[PDB]
């Protein structure tokens with residue numbers, strides 16, 4: 009029988025089992041401490057704050073105090089202008105950090121498969137973003153060349169982006185390739201941001217917004233259909249019906265492009281971030297991160313076969329994702 | 339300076355990671371490790387044994403495998419070396435500490451309200467669960483049972499001159515039983531809330547200590563029902579604000595017989611202790627977040643004691659056998 013050491017127990021207490029520090033880092037981010045210093049210009053109880061700072065000091069985020077109180081190298085990651093933007097990710101008014109707090113309901117989540125977001129905040133995730141302007145804006149800012157660059161658009165005329173958000177990706181494919189038409193299918197909130205972006209990019213003549221619900225049949229056909237970070241939001245049955253709607257909308261010889269996290273045997277991709285994203289999707293909305301093989305198999309059920317596979321990444325965070333091109337079977 | 343890759347890795351996986359600690363608490367709660375040790379080899383069997391959603395569970399397990407608590411499955415699924423900390427019989431008892439049906443992990447969830455703790459200096463426990471810590475345990479007996487079981491420790495002072503020990507807030511009475519068994523001439527009295535007090539009655543009756551160790555249910559904010567030549571305050575003061583700690587201290591001074599000694603057992607940091615300040619601050623944030631308490635340095639405890647009329651006679655370092663946790667034993671005399 010295996011026997012824990014002093015170092016195992018130290019890792020459990022300080023890292024793997026530690027819920028205090030992650031909360032302390034979120035509070036610190038939500039007071040721009042690594043900026044505000046460059047801490048009581050903050051509406052904070054004076055005693056409470058130094059108690060927090062003492063903890064932030066011990067875990068390698070600050071130094072100094074009663075020589076001078078300055079962030080460490082690590083501490084700089086909560087610097088507003090750092091290109092990892094971890095300060096905004098951790099900010100408690102932001103939509104992700106806000107969602108993260110629902111992890112305290114993880115017990116029920118695992119008992120039942122059901123999301124926790126509603127239990128903590130009233131509305132399920134997407135409904136909450138559209139009724140609350142501030143969470144929509146912050147989520148938007150956090151999720152802002154992969155497809156436009158990875159793909160030969162010369163043999164394509166019409167791209168239908170399903171659940172394509174504020175239109176950023178469709179705008180860019182269209183700006184890169186002047187000959188293309190595009191159509192975006194989205195809920196109201198992101199649809200309206202799409203209209204504004206298309207109009208200001210001078211694309212309204214060839215790139216349109218069709219507000220709607222991707223569980224209902226898609227309004228148009230197209231020779232390329234895009235599902236970019238959509239499937240992971242949904243359960244198998246729900247992702248199956250989105251896929252099936254996508255197949256119907258596919259012109260002859262048309263291609264479905266799935267942009268998502270899709271791990272492969274010897275990928276080299278950090279499984280930590282795969283499981284983390286996975287538990288987030290489970291907890292926030294009952295979705296799931298799927299591997300390459302699982303996506304392929306769900307696509308097969310919807311009448312689609314894999315034609316090609318490629319990778320992209322991130323100029324910011326350690327996150328490899330894939331683009332999986334599918335054709336109709338019959 | 340410029341943050342390296344390594345420093346981003348640490349923030350995301352450790353310092354900023356709220357998911358993994360909740361995953362540990364869920365695993366502790368479902369007794370996942372114990373179920374694997376008692377024969378469960380498959381995912382399916384685990385799921386029936388824990389009455390959980392099979393796919394959801396397998397996804398928790400994948401996360402637990404990645405972070406090093408579990409390993410293989412896909413030979414069969416078992417704890418890692420580190421994961422054996424979650425076995426219920428491990429001396430560190432981390433499975434019970436992390437258990438979401440137990441008081442401490444329960445109260446840990448109130449850390450989501452930390453922003454308003456840092457803003458107001460008030461505890462968050464009430465904002466989440468309705469009533470504040472001790473009131474809650476008072477009203478919810480299953481949470482009070484688990485809190486008493488967690489503080490259980492299942493001493494090296496000089497007891498030969500001592501006749502009567504008063505343990506103020508002495509939990510279910512483990513400290514008092516240890517002292518009495520080591521010093522047979524001694525008499526004992528425990529003051530505690532109703533739950534701890536009955537569990538202490540049971541302990542002493544079972545041990546053969548009832549004829550010289552007695553229990554008095556009571557409240558240490560009201561005057562104490564006996565005097566003793568030694569009074570003990572073991573991990574009481576850190577639950578309270580300066581003000582409440584002071585009215586406990588004065589209650590204890592009043593029950594201190596002529597020439598008596600007040601023993602305070604608490605975390606009492608000193609500048610060159612070498613004691614790990616991670617645990618000092620963690621526990622400090624917990625006392626703030628849970629009940630408006632505070633962990634005090636040696637100087638702060640000794641200054642507070644001064645206001646109640648007490649002078650320090652001696653101080654000793656000791657520490658838990660199981661966890662990395664130094665603490666101190668501060669002996670005081672009534673200054674008149």
Ligand SMILES: CC[C@@]1(O)C[C@H](O[C@H]2C[C@H](N(C)C)[C@H](O[C@@H]3C[C@H](O)[C@@H](O[C@H]4CCC(=O)[C@@H](C)O4)[C@H](C)O3)[C@H](C)O2)c2c(cc3c(c2O)C(=O)c2c(O)cccc2C3=O)C1O
Nearest residue numbers: 104151152153154155176177180237288292321322325327
């Ligand atoms: C730490 C890594 C990571 O960002 C990983 C993951 O983000 C993925 C998907 C992002 N998108 C699209 C939402 C984003 O992917 C992009 C999209 C973009 O089209 C692609 O090329 C863009 C570049 C920008 C632009 O010019 C337009 C035209 O095109 C770029 C290289 O990658 C990011 C880099 O990786 C990701 C995270 C968190 C969350 C999500 C993620 O997809 C979610 O989808 C998510 C969610 O859906 C609901 C609640 C919470 C979350 C999350 O908390 C992460 O933690």
Ligand SMILES: CC[C@@]1(O)C[C@H](O[C@H]2C[C@H](N(C)C)[C@H](O[C@H]3C[C@H](O)[C@@H](O[C@H]4CCC(=O)[C@@H](C)O4)[C@H](C)O3)[C@H](C)O2)c2c(cc3c(c2O)C(=O)c2c(O)cccc2C3=O)[C@H]1O
Nearest residue numbers: 442489491493494513573577621624656657658659661663
């Ligand atoms: C990370 C570990 C640690 O358990 C540290 C701390 O526990 C300490 C104090 C415990 N007591 C008394 C409350 C308890 O300490 C012990 C063990 C020690 O060996 C024992 O005696 C000594 C004296 C020296 C000696 O020779 C040997 C043989 O015996 C002493 C009387 O009690 C525990 C094992 O360590 C401690 C923690 C958490 C909490 C508390 C703690 O005291 C609390 O007191 C606490 C609370 O009071 C209310 C809500 C929540 C908490 C907590 O969440 C943890 O952080």
Ligand SMILES: C[S@@+](CC[C@H](N)C(=O)[O-])C[C@H]1O[C@@H](n2cnc3c(N)ncnc32)[C@H](O)[C@@H]1O
Nearest residue numbers: 171172173193194195198220221222223236237
């Ligand atoms: C992760 S997001 C953004 C994905 C986007 N393709 C991107 O890469 O930025 C998923 C999107 O799908 C949308 N969505 C959710 N339910 C929907 C539905 N029933 N119909 C259409 N869109 C929906 C949301 O509005 C959200 O913008």
Ligand SMILES: C[S@@+](CC[C@H](N)C(=O)[O-])C[C@H]1O[C@@H](n2cnc3c(N)ncnc32)[C@H](O)[C@@H]1O
Nearest residue numbers: 489507508509529530531534556557558572573
């Ligand atoms: C950390 S605990 C246990 C301390 C115990 N001396 C030990 O070291 O194991 C604090 C204790 O003080 C008690 N307590 C809280 N309020 C009290 C009160 N008003 N009167 C008596 N005991 C109280 C609790 O019952 C709890 O057992």
